[PDB]
């Protein structure tokens, strides 16, 4: 939970929101449709929107590998401040810069 978390937005709405009000760097966290109960990060980068699933194992949260965190907010806050730690599978850096709404 915090100023990027949208408790009631779909993936689609999220990428329309990011493509209309966001800028390159804008992100939010939302509920996951594939895994009800979990959250997803959506980020506007390059000329599109990237969606990253967040694993809640039942013990911790992570990005299906990488650093683990006790709450969802510690996850996001970490990747927002630690430069270069969020990367796609292919190695390109994902930037978590502007918390939307």
């Amino acid at each position: 939970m915090r100023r990027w978390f949208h408790p009631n937005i779909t993936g689609v709405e999220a990428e329309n929101l990011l493509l209309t009000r966001g800028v390159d760097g804008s992100f939010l966290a939302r509920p996951s449709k594939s895994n009800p109960g979990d959250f997803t990060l959506s980020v506007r980068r390059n000329g599109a929107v990237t969606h990253i699933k967040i694993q809640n194992t039942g013990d911790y949260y992570d990005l299906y590998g990488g650093e683990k965190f006790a709450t969802l907010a510690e996850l996001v806050q970490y990747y927002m401040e630690h430069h270069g730690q969020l990367k796609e599978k292919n190695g390109d850096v994902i930037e978590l810069k502007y918390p939307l709404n």
């Binding site: 990237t50 990005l63 969020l86 796609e88 599978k89």
Partner: peptide
């Protein structure tokens, strides 16, 4: 639905 991006640790 939407498309997902895996992350590299």
């Amino acid at each position: 639905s939407v498309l997902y991006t895996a992350v590299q640790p």
